[PDB]
């Protein structure tokens, strides 16, 4: 009884499709699930094999001439981003439980309507000279890049909501104690040539 | 929903730690899992009323669980080992006599083991204002919040617009960064990012502040050095809107 989910973390673009890759080993009939968690929720079940009903858009089909149970989904959504888990029910192990696979983190990226890639300073709000560097408005193709220098921080990037607005942004951030830390150098990853300064 | 307490704890290697969980009402099945970061859980235990139907996994040299009366249980560590750090996972089926049904689950609880309490300290939080340049090019305005230097990754940010929490426009980071990556006791830096528009941020009645819950050590926990002790708790930063 073993239950494989084979990668931990699946990418993809909002509005592509989605395929969550679990199989199984069992010998016999198995009964198979898909547990789902949200930031912050609890973990939940979304889907039993048991039923063709979408549930939040989602399906998955027992194959047993391949022992999967992928989960699918045509059009990814921004809120379908989660932690995914799939698991195969045990007929009298003690009594009956189950058993879930490894997960797989299921991140959904925005389409950037239009990219205005630039990096800002901004400054302490307390009177200190401390400022951290701001890269925003960039296009889901860039990818930042870890610093490689030991006092320099910069954080993944990050997509905010201004549904007010209807507005999605990307957004990375830079920091250094050094004197010689500068926001034209903060990032010298792969940035757009028409990056704002 | 499923309960369970507490939520964090901290405790140091070979100490003791007792986890608890009450069961949706009725519900004749309560399992326990373990859950290690970027792995999926595993069954500790599993109650059909108050008998022990599956302990084939329990680490029965160190991990033990009752419940007494068929309702709420107890798990308990004794002594903890630092591989003990993870999720403890409780859940509850009806146990009716068909096929698997559902599992209910609650929040977890989040177990860190350390070797030294006294690598444990709270955040630094500080907010930065809003670029003049990118009010002027974008007509919005990003604030960021940094929490910083904190030990274990406890933490929960949060951003308050006038007193209230907000969500709009808000995002922090999934994970802390190291702040030494060359070190196994390295403190915690996160970011988060608050952006609206740039008519509401000129506006200076409105306040912006940046919330770090942080959960450390407990009331009974001993602590006889200097700094003060990193219980659990709040660290703010703000500022106000400018024109």
């Known amino acids: 009884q073993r239950v494989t989910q084979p990668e931990k973390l699946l990418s993809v673009f909002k509005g592509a499709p989605v395929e969550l890759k679990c199989n199984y080993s069992?010998?016999?009939?198995?009964?198979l699930f898909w547990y789902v968690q949200y930031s912050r929720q609890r973990l939940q079940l979304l889907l039993r094999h048991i039923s063709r009903e979408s549930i939040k858009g989602f399906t998955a089909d027992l194959n047993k001439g391949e022992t999967s149970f992928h989960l699918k989904k045509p059009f990814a959504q921004e809120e379908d981003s989660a932690m995914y888990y799939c698991?195969?029910?045990?007929?009298?192990?003690?009594?009956?439980?189950?058993?879930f696979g490894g997960g797989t983190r299921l991140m959904v990226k925005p389409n950037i309507q239009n990219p205005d890639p630039a990096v800002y300073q901004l400054r302490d709000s307390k009177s200190s000279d401390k400022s951290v560097c701001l890269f925003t408005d960039f296009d889901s193709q860039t990818n930042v890049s870890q610093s490689k220098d030991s006092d320099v921080y910069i954080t993944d990037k990050c997509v905010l909501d201004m549904r007010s607005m209807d507005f999605k942004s990307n957004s990375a951030v830079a920091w250094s104690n050094k004197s010689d830390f500068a926001c034209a150098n903060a990032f010298n990853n792969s940035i757009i040539p028409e990056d704002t300064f | 929903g499923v309960a369970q307490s507490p939520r964090y704890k901290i405790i140091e290697k070979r100490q003791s730690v007792a986890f608890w969980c009450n069961p949706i009402?009725?519900?004749?099945?309560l399992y326990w899992y373990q859950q290690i970061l970027g792995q999926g859980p595993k069954l500790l235990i599993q109650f059909q009323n108050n008998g022990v139907v599956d302990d084939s996994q329990l680490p029965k040299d160190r991990f033990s669980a009752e419940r007494l009366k068929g309702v709420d249980s107890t798990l308990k560590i004794q002594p903890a080992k630092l591989e003990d750090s993870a999720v403890y996972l409780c859940?509850?089926?009806?146990?009716?006599?068909?096929?698997?049904?559902?599992?209910?689950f609650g929040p977890g609880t989040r177990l860190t083991v350390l070797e030294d309490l006294k690598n444990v300290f709270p955040p630094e939080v500080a907010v930065f204002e809003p670029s003049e340049a990118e009010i002027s090019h974008t007509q919005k305005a990003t604030l960021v919040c940094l929490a910083t230097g904190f030990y274990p990754d406890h933490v929960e940010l949060s951003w308050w617009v006038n007193g209230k929490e907000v969500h709009s426009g808000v995002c922090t980071d999934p994970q802390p960064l190291k702040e030494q990556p060359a070190l196994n006791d390295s403190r915690y830096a996160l970011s988060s990012r608050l952006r609206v528009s740039a008519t509401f941020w000129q506006n200076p009645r409105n306040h912006f502040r940046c919330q770090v819950q942080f959960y450390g050590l407990s009331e009974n926990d001993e602590w006889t050095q200097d700094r003060a002790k990193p219980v659990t708790q709040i660290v703010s930063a703000e500022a106000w809107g400018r024109a």
């Open positions: 009402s009725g519900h004749a099945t």
């Open positions: 859940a509850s089926s009806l146990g009716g006599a068909g096929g698997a049904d559902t599992q209910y």
């Open positions: 069992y010998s016999g009939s198995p009964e």
């Open positions: 698991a195969l029910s045990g007929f009298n192990n003690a009594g009956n439980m189950l058993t």
